[PDB]
Amino acid sequence: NFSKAMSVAKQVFNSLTEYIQGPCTGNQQSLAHSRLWDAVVGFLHVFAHMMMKLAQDSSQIELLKELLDLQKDMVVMLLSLLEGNVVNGMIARQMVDMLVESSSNVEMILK
């Protein structure tokens, strides 16, 4: 059930990248003024805690692989929102606040 839920989440993140990749400024601006950040904050929290819990066990290696590739597709989506950004841009400043809110969960990932 965890595997299939992540499988769907991979496709939905990959679709969102397609809409913005090749700077589509309007599509990038739309995803800014939306609830995408809330889904981004929530996914980081689940990612961080599931990483450490599943790293421990030797029977969760396969599930940890699914969580690993899913998080890679998510950050690729965040990078796509930054294509063509200017300094002090709307999309970049709103992206900082998301990282500020999820600072604790980012720290657990980086270690």
From Swiss-Prot:
Q: What is this protein called?
A: Ryanodine receptor 1
Binding positions for Ca(2+)? Answer: E18
Q: Where in the cell is it found?
A: Sarcoplasmic reticulum membrane
Role this protein plays: Cytosolic calcium-activated calcium channel that mediates the release of Ca(2+) from the sarcoplasmic reticulum into the cytosol and thereby plays a key role in triggering muscle contraction following depolarization of T-tubules. Repeated very high-level exercise increases the open probability of the channel and leads to Ca(2+) leaking into the cytoplasm. Can also mediate the release of Ca(2+) from intracellular stores in neurons, and may thereby promote prolonged Ca(2+) signaling in the brain. Required for normal embryonic development of muscle fibers and skeletal muscle.
Q: In which tissues is it expressed?
A: Detected in skeletal muscle (at protein level). Fast- or slow-twitch skeletal muscle.
- Recorded superkingdom: Eukaryota
- Which residues pair up as cystines? none
Q: Lineage from the top down?
A: Eukaryota, Metazoa, Chordata, Craniata, Vertebrata
Modifications the protein undergoes after translation, according to the UniProt entry: The N-terminus is blocked.
Q: Which gene encodes it?
A: RYR1
What is the UniProt domain comment for this protein?
The calcium release channel activity resides in the C-terminal region while the remaining part of the protein constitutes the 'foot' structure spanning the junctional gap between the sarcoplasmic reticulum (SR) and the T-tubule. Pore opening is mediated via the cytoplasmic calcium-binding domains that mediate a small rotation of the channel-forming transmembrane regions that then leads to channel opening.
